[PDB]
């Protein structure tokens, strides 16, 4: 150009520098891998997020448990108050005797909410009622009320957690539930490559109004629990979400991976309540591996055009830190093999 | 009891409907049947700004009719000089999931927000020579849909938790909250004199709010789906909406009723954005079938097509002096029509 003034050339060259930096930044992050989590409530997304951070980045320092003490205290007090509300919710009488008056007094005392440390009297009453046969039976009696599944862990270690000189550990911080509004993302370096994974939880709104923002992600991970096959059922709603996610017109080319959490809980509880409650059409024996294969079979048949895409399934136990690493190694191996370009 | 309240609400609905119907003697079409038609409107492409690397979700014109801002999903805000197609600033964001942007009427600030439930305000004129975050406003419990400056010190936001709010940028607390509403607020438009505004949601209704008190004055239930776009008429006595049922509609404040429905056959896609001309004669609307139609605002006839995009047109704006129209789309291009 020749008509350009003295100042305009500086503007043009600054625009060129901006273009160069923008191009460099754009192509720098165009080679990474983006995973995305979905599912229903209490499926276990945050658990595997914390597991991923523990494994592939670094551990947790001792100071983290200092601030997680408040949330674990809140979780265990909520669990015990839910238990003592549930024992009278069905009006099931128990052999409490003096423990009934103790329960009434501690229900009154539950409004303290100091969140610093339990009362020694409170801990003692909780301990002595925990030995009552009636409330113990009620704890496993009716799988109707929304009871946290970590209550069997938190209330079985009151002789350590309730002491003033108590600090949480990795196991304690892993089994800690919290509902936080907003998107959660975590990025880390693995296999000489950068991974970014999201967690769209707490977006209590219409999902179809923003799902198109994630068009063309590298992979989608679906988390489906198994221990909730007779909880008010929920597995039918999980399938009624899966058929909508899988048959989407946006996720035509994206490998879908299934995680089946809570496999140990399923193994424990499969010997009590038969699978016929959730699926009336089942007719096999009450054994573990056949029931799991049945779940897989009636959970895979919701995919149209199975020739084009195939879903990848694993049996993980996200609380256990050992079995997440191997499963993630397998899934990153298959996503690398499926992305040869 | 509850049932008596349901009958009271039904009788009130019948009374409001009858009072609106009782004052609808003549239609807008019969009165404006003798107006001469506009003719044919042919707009060419003047600019093809190409600097984004992902889908473009929002844009806004500056009040001096020369600068504009655009937001995209690669995590960048870019300020453009439309006369020379130069880039003035490029601002990286802390969250890449952005759905809206706004420009201050003075030119000093820029707003942004998205799936992080946070609205971020950026200062454009500082001694250090780089754009830095001035404040972050938090308190919504759902993704942020739209935001519009009222002043250099006040801003109005809407979110998917069925609420709107009015902010004080120095102080981190909401000054007014708007809660009577049932669906999800998706779009928002400020009046020219900045005392009222309208909001359109996915419960197929629109509401007129008063800023000073924060009360709803009128409610319009005429569409059959989600409402996706909204704009106020320049006169200040009417507004227009655009929805997912492939139909735009014009509502009138003073008569509190509906005047016209702008629909044509063979069109089965939704509308993403809507805007008026300076004299209120042409209405511009963007569709999912990759085109953009221009409507004669008094006669339901179609007066042209703008057909220069390769994907769905998502944002659209008209300058203050009315010299050009800018459209953005998911194919990562901006075009200037005149």
């Amino acid at each position: 150009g020749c008509t350009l003034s003295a100042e305009d050339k500086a503007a043009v060259e600054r625009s060129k520098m901006i273009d160069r930096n923008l191009r460099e930044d754009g192509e720098k992050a165009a080679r990474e891998v983006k995973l995305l989590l979905l599912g229903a409530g209490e499926s276990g997304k945050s658990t595997i997020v914390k597991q991923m951070k523990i494994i592939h980045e670094a551990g947790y320092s001792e100071e983290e448990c200092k601030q997680y003490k408040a949330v674990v205290y809140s979780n265990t007090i909520q669990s015990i108050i839910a238990i003592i509300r549930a024992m009278g919710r069905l009006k099931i009488d128990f052999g409490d005797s003096a423990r009934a008056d103790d329960a009434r007094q501690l229900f009154v005392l539950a409004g303290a909410a100091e969140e610093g440390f339990m009362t020694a009297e409170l801990a003692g009453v909780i301990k002595r009622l925990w030995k009552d046969s009636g409330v113990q039976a009620c704890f496993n009696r009716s799988r109707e009320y929304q009871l946290n599944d970590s209550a069997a862990y938190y209330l079985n270690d009151l002789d350590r957690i309730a002491q003033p000189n108590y600090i949480p550990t990795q196991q304690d911080v892993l089994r800690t539930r919290v509902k936080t509004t907003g998107i959660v993302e975590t990025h880390f370096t693995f296999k000489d490559l950068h991974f970014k994974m999201f967690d769209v939880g707490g977006q209590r709104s219409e999902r179809k109004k923003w799902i198109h923002c994630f068009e063309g992600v590298t992979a989608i991970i679906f988390c489906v629990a198994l221990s909730d096959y007779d909880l008010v059922n929920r597995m039918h709603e999980s399938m009624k979400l899966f058929d909508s996610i899988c048959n989407n017109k946006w996720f035509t080319d994206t490998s879908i991976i299934l995680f089946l959490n809570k496999k140990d809980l399923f193994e424990e509880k499969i010997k009590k309540s038969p699978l016929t409650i959730c699926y009336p059409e089942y007719a096999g024996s009450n054994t573990y591996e056949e029931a799991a294969a049945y779940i897989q079979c009636q959970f895979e048949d919701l995919n149209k055009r199975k020739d084009t895409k195939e879903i990848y399934t694993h049996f993980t136990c996200a609380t256990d830190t050992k079995n997440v690493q191997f499963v993630f190694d397998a899934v990153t191996d298959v996503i690398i093999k499926n992305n040869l370009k | 009891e509850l049932d008596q309240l349901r009958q009271e609400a039904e009788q009130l609905k019948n009374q409001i409907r009858d009072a609106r119907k009782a004052c609808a003697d003549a239609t807008l079409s019969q009165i404006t049947n003798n107006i001469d038609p506009v003719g044919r409107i042919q707009m060419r492409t003047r600019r093809t700004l190409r600097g984004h690397l992902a889908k473009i979700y929002a844009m806004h014109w500056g009040t001096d009719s020369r600068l504009l801002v655009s937001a995209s999903q690669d995590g960048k805000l870019i300020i453009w000089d439309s006369y020379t197609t130069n880039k003035v600033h490029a601002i990286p964001l802390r969250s890449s999931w952005v759905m809206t942007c706004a420009y201050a009427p003075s030119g000093n600030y820029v707003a942004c927000g998205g799936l992080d439930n946070i609205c971020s305000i950026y200062n454009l004129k500082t001694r250090e020579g780089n754009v830095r975050v001035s404040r972050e406003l938090a308190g919504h419990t759902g993704y942020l849909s739209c935001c519009r400056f009222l002043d250099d010190n006040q801003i109005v936001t809407s979110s998917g938790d069925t609420t709107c709010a009015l902010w004080d940028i120095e102080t981190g607390q909401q000054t007014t909250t708007f809660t009577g509403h049932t669906g999800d607020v998706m779009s928002l438009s400020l009046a020219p004199d900045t005392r009222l505004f309208v909001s359109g949601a996915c419960d197929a209704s629109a509401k007129l709010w008063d800023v000073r008190e924060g009360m709803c004055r009128q409610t319009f239930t005429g569409h059959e789906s989600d409402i996706n776009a909204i704009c106020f008429f320049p006169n200040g006595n009417a507004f227009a909406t655009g929805s997912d049922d492939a139909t735009c509609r014009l509502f009138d404040l003073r008569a509190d009723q509906e005047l016209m429905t702008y629909s044509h056959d063979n069109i089965i896609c939704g509308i993403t954005s809507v805007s008026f001309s300076k004299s209120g004669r042409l209405l511009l609307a963007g569709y999912d079938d990759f085109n953009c139609n221009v409507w004669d605002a008094l006669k339901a006839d179609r007066a042209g097509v703008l057909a220069g995009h390769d994907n769905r047109v998502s944002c659209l704006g008209v300058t203050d002096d009315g010299m050009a129209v800018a459209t953005g789309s998911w194919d990562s291009f901006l075009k200037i029509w005149n």
Partner: single-chain antibody
Framework: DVQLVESGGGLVQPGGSRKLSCSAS????????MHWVRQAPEKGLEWVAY????????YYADTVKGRFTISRDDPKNTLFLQMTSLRSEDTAMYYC??????????????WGQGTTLTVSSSDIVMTQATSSVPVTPGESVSISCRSS???????????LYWFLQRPGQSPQLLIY???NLASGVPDRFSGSGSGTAFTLTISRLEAEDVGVYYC?????????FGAGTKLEL
């Protein structure tokens, strides 16, 4: 805050060499273009050299071409000037000025301090009617600066700048492109005028505003100053 601190300079034997450095602190150094501006023990200012951002464009004055060299080191936030074959006409005081160019910016806004160098033992012409105009506090005055070639470009802008230097301080930007008031400057200053005839008007003149006023053109390189007009009580 924004700061530019200078060091170096001293007595030099003629024909020798020296180097001056300009260290910045308080702003994003790598996004600005830098200028070197020289003065004289009694004469006016004269532009010397200019380095862009990213070091992609270099200009030199007509009398120092082929001897002086300008450079920058972005990571350490330093600006360098290498000076060779020092002639006796280079005895001066050197200033380091920052400027940024985009739509609506204000170049030449911070000047910093100087360093003293003692070497001793087609251009547009701007005329500023150099003389002392006596003033008294309370009244209003006008200052004129006529050009030789019209400064109005075809894009509508007219590139004229006005500077004020109080006694024993560094120069300060007042008006850029004849009408726009710089940041932090009281609204008592007004600028107007047509092509090749410009005026600066001060109304209700206050105190501490005594000094020398300079007019500068930024239409095309090399940049040229005026002789400078003096205001005294």
């Amino acid at each position: 805050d924004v700061q530019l601190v200078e060091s170096g300079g001293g007595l030099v034997q003629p024909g020798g060499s020296r180097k001056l450095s300009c260290s910045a602190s308080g702003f994003a150094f790598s996004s600005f273009g830098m200028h070197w501006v020289r003065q004289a023990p009694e004469k006016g200012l004269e532009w010397v050299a200019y380095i862009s951002s990213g070091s992609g464009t270099i200009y030199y004055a007509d009398t120092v071409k082929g001897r002086f060299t300008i450079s920058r080191d972005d990571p350490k936030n330093t600006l360098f000037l290498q000076m060779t074959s020092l002639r006796s006409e280079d005895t001066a005081m050197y200033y380091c000025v920052r400027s940024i160019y985009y739509y609506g910016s204000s170049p030449f806004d911070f000047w910093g301090q100087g360093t003293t160098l003692t070497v001793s033992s087609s251009d547009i012409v701007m005329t500023q009617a150099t003389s002392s105009v006596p003033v008294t506090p309370g009244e209003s005055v006008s200052i004129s600066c006529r050009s030789s070639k019209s400064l109005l470009h075809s894009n509508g802008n007219t590139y004229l700048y006005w500077f004020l230097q109080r006694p024993g301080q560094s120069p300060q930007l007042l008006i850029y492109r004849m009408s726009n008031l710089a940041s932090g400057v009281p609204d008592r200053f007004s600028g107007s005028g047509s092509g090749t005839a410009f005026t600066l008007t001060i109304s209700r003149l206050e105190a501490e505003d005594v000094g020398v006023y300079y007019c500068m053109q930024h239409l095309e390189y090399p940049l040229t100053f005026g002789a400078g007009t003096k205001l005294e009580l």
